[PDB]
């Protein structure tokens, strides 16, 4: 009924202390069957796709959220992150969100 959309706001930033837990949000909009969403981290000119991580779906009213879990948050997590969606055979990216540790 509608297009898949990733609503991370431009210039998003979260300043957190190491040793504490954190949940990084990726607002996903969908009208069909839930789309495949993934997370990456900016390292120079490429966004390094993150493997084997704790992630969760949190369904709301008009929106839904894909979350990356930092259980806990380490100092070697300071950087800018992004979520991407591959559905109709192409990759759609969101705005990058920065994490200050």
């Amino acid at each position, epitope marked *: 009924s509608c297009d898949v959309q990733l609503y991370i706001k431009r210039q998003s930033e979260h300043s957190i202390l190491a040793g504490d837990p954190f949940e990084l949000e990726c607002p996903v909009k969908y009208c069909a069957n839930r789309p495949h969403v993934t997370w990456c981290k900016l390292n120079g000119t490429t966004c390094v796709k993150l493997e084997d991580r704790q992630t969760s779906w949190k369904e709301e009213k008009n929106i839904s959220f894909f979350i990356l879990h930092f259980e806990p948050v380490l100092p070697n997590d300071n950087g800018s992150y992004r979520c991407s969606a591959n559905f109709q055979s192409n*990759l759609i990216e969101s705005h990058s969100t920065t994490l200050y540790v």
Partner: antibody
Amino acid sequence: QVQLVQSGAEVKKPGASVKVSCKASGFSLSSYGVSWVRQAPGQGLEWMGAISYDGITYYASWAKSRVTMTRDTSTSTVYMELSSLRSEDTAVYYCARGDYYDDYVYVYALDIWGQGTLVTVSS
Amino acid sequence: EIVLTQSPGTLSLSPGERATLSCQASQSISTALAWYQQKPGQAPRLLIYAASTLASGIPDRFSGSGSGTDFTLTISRLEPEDFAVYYCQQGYSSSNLDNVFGGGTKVEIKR
């Protein structure tokens, strides 16, 4: 004002490389992306790729193997290097500023364009 | 992959008249569709961004419409400075593509 100024014309041998520069004035490179678009004589527009606001590079599927895109945020200059040049690469190369007009959706249009750089490739 | 297809290839219209430019995407691109004008020996110029919005200092005779795959650029009162070549561009995705642009449409004077 808000402008994009490119380097002078280039004449190259086949198998050589070319590095095109593109200077931003009136704005910040760390807020905008820069796309590269080439045009052959009498032909249509051909996207080569871009370096976004957050420093990530995208390349056209045909250009990934010979094209490199950089930025020097202090000098506020973007570059494009096209290596192992072929005669069929002769074109006018443009840098265009990518405006991510939407604050929630990662989408763009190219509002300010460079004056073009003619690169001739021949033996 | 995302393929932008422009129609017609060329349109012979007299000044004063109305132009209807068509751009079709192979798969949906939401409203990440822009329209440019290129006159001979000049760099392209942004007309309409976000499928329907007007760019900085662009006259009101240029109107954009559409969402997903079907898109139109309409010039209602074709002036002589309007006789140029027009290209559509998707800002939707950039990963593993041949070109973010359509093949263009030349608008020429019918006489």
